[PDB]
């Protein structure tokens, strides 16, 4: 009879996990502040890692990797990629980015802004989306917090019919042995309104967030194209597959990112252990070149994929540590 606690009520993913655990009849939920737990579904902020693994007679596991925030924050991700030899600086799959503080690498950003202007090539960026540096710096200083300036991919792959923009969300599970598992089911969070190349003011066809979009539901149910359809589209419209044209790059980027920070966050020889679910956001240009946009530390899932993914988490991340009385994951080997 294993025990667990829940300290993030807003987690739609782990609300389903706690449900599945109880339904086995071999897992018992304790109160929030009960230290005698086997599993901790921790909070998103100020997770007390320091108090883990100090309970005699209890193997303890938490659903978060301490230090993984360096990968899952926009200012941190840029710094991580730029300073890490395994990634920096000729990184081919991450857009040119810079860290900017409100009134740092502001002078460095302008040095590159000149080449694009004194080269008469594409010079659109993103924090809002603009082609003028002055319009952007005035926006960051007016907000208050730290922002990141990034090169805007002016030539994205566009779905047909619709001439639409999209981004790919991949769910990745890293268990206690630092096995990197890619969920075989990803999702394309598509824009419904046709992509406009000239007018950047209209951020409804540039930004592909599920909330902003909610022409919603015209082409597919809820502006979400799964892999079977997207693969079929790539075969019919471009004479290729999702595996060859995109997924190899995706698996490569995921593998590379987590390998880089492994020695900093691994719980191999620690007194407590960690697993964590990541959500990688990718962007595809018209030449079928995959770009990493960012990494989310606390990702939500797609309604269709909750049942399968959440069950998947139990099998390889929880039951692997706490056994009870074909696979939906692709193991990215290293």
């Amino acid at each position: 009879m294993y025990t667990f606690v829940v300290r993030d009520e807003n987690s739609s993913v782990y609300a389903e996990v706690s449900r599945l655990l109880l339904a086995t009849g071999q897992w018992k939920r304790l109160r929030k502040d009960n230290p005698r737990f086997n599993l901790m579904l921790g909070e998103r902020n100020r997770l007390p890692f320091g108090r883990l693994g100090h309970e005699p007679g209890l193997v303890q596991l938490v659903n978060y990797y301490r230090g993984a925030d360096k990968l899952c924050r926009k200012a941190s991700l840029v710094k991580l990629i730029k300073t890490s030899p395994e990634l920096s600086e000729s990184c081919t799959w991450f857009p040119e980015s810079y860290v900017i503080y409100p009134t740092d690498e502001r002078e460095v950003f302008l040095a590159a802004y000149n080449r694009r202007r004194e080269g008469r090539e594409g010079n659109v960026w993103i924090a809002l989306i603009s082609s003028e540096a002055s319009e952007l710096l005035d926006f960051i200083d007016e907000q208050g917090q730290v922002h990141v300036i990034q090169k805007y991919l002016e030539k994205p792959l566009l779905l047909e019919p619709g001439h639409r923009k999209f981004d790919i969300r991949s769910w990745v599970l890293v268990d206690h042995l630092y096995n990197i598992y890619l969920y075989r089911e990803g999702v394309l969070r598509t824009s419904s309104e046709p992509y406009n190349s000239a007018n950047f003011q209209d951020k409804t066809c540039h930004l592909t967030n599920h909330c902003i979009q909610k022409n919603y539901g015209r082409y597919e149910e809820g502006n979400e194209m799964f892999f079977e359809e997207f693969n079929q589209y790539l075969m019919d419209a471009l004479n290729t597959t999702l595996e060859n044209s995109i997924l190899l790059q995706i698996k490569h980027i995921i593998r590379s990112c987590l390998m880089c920070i492994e020695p900093a966050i691994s719980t191999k020889h620690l007194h407590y252990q960690s697993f964590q679910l990541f959500g990688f956001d990718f962007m595809v240009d018209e030449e079928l070149k995959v770009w990493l946009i960012e990494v989310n530390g606390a990702p939500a899932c797609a309604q269709k994929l909750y049942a399968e993914l959440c069950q998947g988490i139990v099998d390889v991340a929880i039951s692997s540590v706490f056994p009870l009385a074909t696979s939906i994951f692709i193991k990215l080997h290293h």
């Binding site: 025990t3 009960n34 005698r36 007679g57």
Partner: protein, 427 residues
Amino acid sequence: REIVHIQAGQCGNQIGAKFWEVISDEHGIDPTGSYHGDSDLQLERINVYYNEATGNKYVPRAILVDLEPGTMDSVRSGPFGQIFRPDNFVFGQSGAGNNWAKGHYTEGAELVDSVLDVVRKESESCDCLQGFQLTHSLGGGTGSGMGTLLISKIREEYPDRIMNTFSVMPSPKVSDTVVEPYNATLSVHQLVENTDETYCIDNEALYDICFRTLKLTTPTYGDLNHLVSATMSGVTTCLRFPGQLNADLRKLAVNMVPFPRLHFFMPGFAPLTSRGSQQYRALTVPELTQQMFDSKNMMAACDPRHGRYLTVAAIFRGRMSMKEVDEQMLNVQNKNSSYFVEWIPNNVKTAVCDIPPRGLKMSATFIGNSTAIQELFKRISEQFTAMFRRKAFLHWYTGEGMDEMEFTEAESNMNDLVSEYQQYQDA
């Protein structure tokens, strides 16, 4: 650190004499007072309970008290009757007639000074007295009335010493008179204020164990006392033998009592055995742990699942894997963490002693400070109220100078104690 033992009344002397009989055998002391053991573990902390005389004679640091000579004459003619210092036999002639007032205010007040002289004589011999332990019943007159009088006067002369008691609670299942709830309620009022540690030995529980579990059709007081002496030997083990912590009465109180008034403990024991009947099969550690935590093994008729454990002290006796003990005890806490309060971290401690009790290859004694103990005091309170609402049998007390108000006050304080235990059950 010496302990001064006191036993008052019929019940107090009968379980008291049985206690000395049991531990004397454990420490290798014979009725003559001479040592005939084989292990040095027996004599290392024997000074806690025994005085040493010339020729290496060991005499219990015990004072026997009663208001009638009947029961104490039976002690002096009992098995280990001769071991006791004859000057420590302090008795009257009138008796108490199961009357708290007689024991506390009239008959006992006439004898209490004689007792305190013997307490003083014993204490002055101590290199460093740590405190006192009293054995008595709460349902009678002497052990209940005079016993609580002694406690109050001992506190007055030794306010910086620990007071411990083994208090036998009355039960209609094993009843002498109808006024036992009166005597008990009046006594609890005293114990709440003037003791640091009280082991609640419930005759209701003892009877149920003998009847339901031990399959004794008609249990006697002797059958009841087999469970008491087994329990008493257990809870005092860590005081009598060299252990990892070398426990004393004060350190026990500090670790067991989070709030001063909540110092009424539920004792437990495993395996439960009847007299004469020898068991041939030693219990495994998982069995000891499971049984000692079961309600059927509690010496206080309270359901531990109806409350939460504030603190727990446990002692395993016999040759066994202390690693296995640790795992099993940690397992109980990890399996049933809801019955342990979360605002007292690590509130369960376990010790182990190599020397097992007579007739058992291994045993486990349980000391629990549970909020479920309120069920005991509520039971007494109900029986108290049923009579007091009609002022029944009160003339036995007013005849000794008591007033009705003193009953009302005693009732209120025990009900307060109940609500105090209830307060932390929902924390």
